[PDB]
Ligand binder design. Structure first.
Ligand SMILES: CC(C)C[C@H](NC(=O)/C=C/c1ccccc1)C(=O)N[C@H](C=O)C[C@@H]1CCNC1=O
Length: 306
């Protein structure tokens, strides 16, 4: 029993974090096979960071403008290129600790683990949701750029995020591992506002199913609702519209609890309209939206506490 925001075990990723220095700027790089990936603003000085032209800044560097340190071992750069907002450094050594990996671009509402690192040395692990507005509510200080977000399937690491910047509201923005930003952000030392954000309705629902799987039914009711009538309430409460695909996705959790999706939607509509009346759900006083249906199936028992 229990339900916690749970990261993936970070060991396979720890073995790939390195430190990358260029001039005075130092940040983290990801070392896989014979390549180190890292944010391209490592080649920027304080002057450059406001309005940098990275094509121009980069051609002025050689391979030996870049210092790559893996633990104590210094790694020799033997090639470099720019891929969107990333730099690809080829090094003379292949990382023997490289795991089976893919690069994926996650979709809004999906979750991933973050391995926060400073000077190429892992520091902490936590679980994040890609918000609809393409930000993540991370925990990052100066020096954290190059930290990665990842999921782990069996023994394959799916890298999906590299950290680049912090927005004025304290949330974070970054790229996939091809250097393409999530959301409309750019790597420039300027304030850029997150778009307005929304609650992830599919995740709220998967988590109410987790509560029932773990044996708690107090919030259910006798009513039901149409998709459209639910979506009138969701829009009043700044919840994402529920679609027929999201209903379909909840099929397995609906099956395991015996609670039809639109019945659970009627439960959520009532929770939105009346509040929770000083009660908790899975230990929380608010409706949680950073667990996907995949997260719920992964963590809960396949046997409901009936
Ligand atoms: C050249 C750019 C892309 C670098 C990036 N710059 C920024 O994140 C600037 C953010 C900002 C906030 C308010 C007003 C104006 C700007 C950065 O510092 N990135 C840092 C990576 O090293 C991570 C920051 C540092 C503090 N917490 C973080 O997540």
């Amino acid at each position: 029993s229990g339900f916690r925001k749970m990261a993936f075990p970070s060991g396979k990723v720890e073995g790939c974090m390195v430190q990358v220095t260029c001039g005075t700027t130092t940040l983290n790089g990801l070392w896989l096979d014979d390549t180190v990936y890292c944010p391209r603003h490592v080649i920027c000085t304080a002057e450059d960071m406001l309005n940098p032209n990275y094509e121009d800044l980069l051609i002025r560097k050689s391979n030996h403008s870049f210092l790559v340190q893996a633990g104590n071992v210094q790694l020799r750069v033997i090639g470099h290129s720019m891929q969107n907002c990333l730099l690809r450094l080829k090094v003379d050594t292949s990382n023997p600790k490289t795991p089976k990996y893919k690069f994926v671009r996650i979709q809004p509402g999906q979750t991933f683990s973050v391995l926060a690192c400073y000077n190429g040395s892992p520091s902490g692990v936590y679980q994040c949701a890609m918000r609809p507005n393409h930000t993540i509510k991370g925990s990052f200080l100066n020096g954290s750029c190059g930290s990665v977000g990842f999921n782990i399937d069996y023994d394959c690491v799916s890298f999906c995020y590299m950290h680049h910047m912090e927005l004025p509201t304290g949330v974070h923005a970054g790229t996939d591992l091809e250097g393409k930003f999530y959301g409309p952000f750019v790597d420039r030392q300027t304030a850029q506002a997150a778009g307005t954000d929304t609650t992830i309705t599919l995740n709220v629902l998967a988590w109410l199913y987790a509560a029932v799987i773990n044996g708690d039914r107090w919030f259910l009711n006798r009513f039901t609702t149409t998709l459209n009538d639910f979506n009138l309430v969701a829009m009043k409460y700044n919840y994402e519209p529920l679609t027929q695909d999201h209903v379909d996705i909840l099929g397995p959790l609906s099956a395991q609890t015996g609670i039809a999706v639109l019945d659970m939607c009627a439960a959520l509509k009532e929770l939105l309209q009346n509040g929770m009346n000083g009660r908790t759900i899975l230990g929380s006083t608010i409706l949680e939206d950073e667990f996907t249906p995949f997260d719920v199936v992964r963590q809960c028992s396949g046997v409901t506490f009936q």
